[PDB]
Tab-separated table of C-alpha atoms in Angstrom:
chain	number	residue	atom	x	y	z
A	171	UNK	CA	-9.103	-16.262	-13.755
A	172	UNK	CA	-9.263	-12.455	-14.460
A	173	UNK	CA	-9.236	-10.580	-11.294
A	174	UNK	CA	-7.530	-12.305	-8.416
A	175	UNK	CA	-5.574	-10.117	-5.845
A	176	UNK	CA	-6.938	-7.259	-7.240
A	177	UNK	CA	-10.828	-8.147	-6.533
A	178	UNK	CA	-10.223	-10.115	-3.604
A	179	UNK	CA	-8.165	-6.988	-1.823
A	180	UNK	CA	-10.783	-5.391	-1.413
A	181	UNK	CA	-12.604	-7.821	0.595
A	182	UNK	CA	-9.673	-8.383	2.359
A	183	UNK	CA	-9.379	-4.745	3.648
A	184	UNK	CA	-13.156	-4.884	4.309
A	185	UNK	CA	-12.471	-8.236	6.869
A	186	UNK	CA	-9.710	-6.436	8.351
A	187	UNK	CA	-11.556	-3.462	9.386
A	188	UNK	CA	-14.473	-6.007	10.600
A	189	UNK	CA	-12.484	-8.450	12.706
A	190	UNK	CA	-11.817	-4.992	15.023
A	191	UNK	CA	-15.174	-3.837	14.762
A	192	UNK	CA	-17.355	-6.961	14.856
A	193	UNK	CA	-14.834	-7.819	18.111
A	194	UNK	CA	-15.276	-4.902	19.687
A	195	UNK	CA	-18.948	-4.273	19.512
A	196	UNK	CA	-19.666	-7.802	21.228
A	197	UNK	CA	-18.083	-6.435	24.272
A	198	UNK	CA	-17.587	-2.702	25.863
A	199	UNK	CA	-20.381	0.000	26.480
A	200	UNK	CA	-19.731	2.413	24.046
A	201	UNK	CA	-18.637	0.690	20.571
């Protein structure tokens, strides 16, 4: 393979950011 944990930390940052957002917008009022 070329790009491994180099292309896949990206989408690993973008999950992590996600999981608290995705999470959070199911419930509470405001965001």
């Amino acid at each position: 393979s070329g790009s491994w944990l180099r292309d896949i930390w990206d989408w690993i940052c973008e999950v992590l950011s996600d999981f608290k957002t995705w999470l959070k917008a199911k419930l509470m009022p405001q965001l």
